[model samples]
Target: SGKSSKALNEAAEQGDLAKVKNLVQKNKIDLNAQDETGMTPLMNAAMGGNLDIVKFLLSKKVNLELKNNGGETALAFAVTNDAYDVAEELIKAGANVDIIVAGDEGDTLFMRAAQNNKKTAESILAKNKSLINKANTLGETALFAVARYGTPADIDFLIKKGADLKLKNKKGQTALDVAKEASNQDTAKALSK
Candidate 1:
């Protein structure tokens, strides 16, 4: 398992489909196997934006919701890395929109997506508007998150989807405040409009 596990991790991390196939199909390694950190092949693939490998793992019944040491699921990693297509693929494979990672200050995939100004990923996550309102450990909503680091498109998408502009984070600062503090003119304007 160690060698197969390492190979899977490497292949998935690099998005090497052929290597992953050889390891899984030829060597007969369990696709769901985890590394020392509890990172599955699916997690590696998700973070690297390997949609084909993600789909393959899903077909093998790999746990889409498996959490690593930080309690981060494959979907979470995908969103954090701004891998929208991969995140969507994982979501369709049963990844939960509301899955919170472990740690006192962990953020959800939606929040991370928002913070990265990934409009596509945000738009995808916003499909379940409930996830937008779901606060992080810091009590920061997706509205607050997008305003901080999101682009005009990201902010506009959230606003159109009914994200509350007045929502505050754990520090009691509104989304607009974060926008201004971060010198995000486009986001600030988007917030007002």
Candidate 2:
């Protein structure tokens, strides 16, 4: 099943659903197998929005929340890549709604999502208001991260959730300061209001 798993991964990457099925049915390949890169079949499926593959993997009790070398879950990939349907499927499958992809400099999944202003991710995060103010290793909040690179909608969501707009980061820079430096004309305008 070891090398078969790698073959399955390759098939999934190529969107070879027929080959994937043949390999799984005939070889009993590991559906959740990780390659040298730790990229699971589910990750490829989720990114591709291969709902059938995702459902099949879930049915096999595969790890829906597997992380790669970068600590990125399938949900993180879906969100960053704007794979909304994949995000929805992963959410329904109980994937980590809040998988914080921790980077060496304390960049979390939420921070990454916020920076890109992924509206769906923002909505999901708003459902868990407590994460809005979570401080990372370098003392950056999700709101702070968003403020640094977010749209007006991002600011609105954070502010609505009572993010400490005035709370300073390790550099003594508040969300307001970050917003200022990013110079998003409209987003900064929203912060001013």
Candidate 3:
């Protein structure tokens, strides 16, 4: 009984669509079943870059908002794992763009993307504009995170997308101030302009 369900999770992770289809159709395994880590089939599929499996699950109307033990949705796993194609599919399917990090103090998808580079952040922004200004618990917006850790390309795109330059962190530092403090000269210059 449970074996089919467990196998369904494995098949999704391995990108085995045929087996996944079989399990779903034959066993009627719970689409939103969570493993020990609370990772649903959708989360595993997205993190494993199994776009086909992801689409299949979504087509069956799997719960997209199901969070793992860490309070991260499938969209969060897809974005953070760099599963761009699956991530886009999830977004197009109406995944919440503002999904937050569980244990992390008020971190959003945008804040996590900002720590990476421009493309991920840009993708998230493209899907949801309102996230640009949403700050974390520390009052750090994507702009603030990008200022400290991102490249000039990241800073420029955020600015181009209209990230407010005036938003300050709990420490009272603006993106420009953080950039300068972190010695991100290129980003600092871009922010100054």
Candidate 4:
């Protein structure tokens, strides 16, 4: 990827494995090249659910830590598209689970995963269990997110992993308070216990 690295971005966006391989194999681009919006080829492949290109990029050791303008990693892209396997592959390749999306109350991988994929949450926990109880700039924990956007099973998993249900966010709302406010019956019930 060069001055107009958009070619690689375009190929990646199209999920063309052959074009992707040719660019990297011929040493025509940097595996970490970014487009105008700062999205890398790996990110496009992830968003496209192109496992082949992702794997190729990984084998070439693309920077899994790179963030786009939206402060999203390739893992973020994978997860956003419900490409759990692709996200897992990135996690397996050593992407940090603690990377936060840039913004007020930036979303941690747990915040993102808690609302999206339980399997991915477990994958992140397996990598680093330190995220538990950690809050964002707005004091939002993964527990709060799971309660707000996920289900009872998600709440159960976090509780088992040592999430402090008693912990409150910027609004001073605990996970249970959030579950109840959201009218999530089962999650409220589970947290009530």
Model 2: residues with Cα > 4 Å off, grouped in runs:
1-4, 102-106, 115-119, 145-154, 180-193
TM per model? Answer: 0.74, 0.75, 0.85, 0.84
lDDT of 1 by residue, 1-193 (tens): 4344787788998999888887788656766667789888889998898988888878778777778887888888887777788877776666787776545767665666656655644554656766767778777877776687778887776677667777777788888888899998888898877
Off by over 4 Å in 1: 1-4, 101-105, 115-127, 145-156, 176-193
lDDT, candidate 4, 28-109, per-residue tens: 6777877778888899989898888889888887789888888889987887778888989898898878787555767786
Maximum-TM-score candidate: 3
Report lDDT per candidate: 0.75, 0.71, 0.82, 0.81
- Give the root-mean-square deviation of each candidate in angstroms: 3.7, 3.4, 2.7, 2.7
lDDT at position 186, candidate 1 = 83
Considering only N, C-alpha and C atoms within 3 Å, which residue pairs clash in candidate 1? none
Q: List the residue pairs that clash in candidate 4.
A: 1-29
How many clashes does each candidate structure show, in the order listed?
0, 1, 0, 1
- Those runs of model 4 whose alpha carbons end farther than 4 Å from true positions after fitting are 1-4, 102-105, 145-153, 180-189
Pairing residues by index, what is the TM-score of model 2?
A: 0.75
TM-score of 4: 0.84
Give the deviation of candidate 2 from the true structure as CA RMSD: 3.4
Report the poorest 10 consecutive residues by lDDT, candidate 3: 1-10
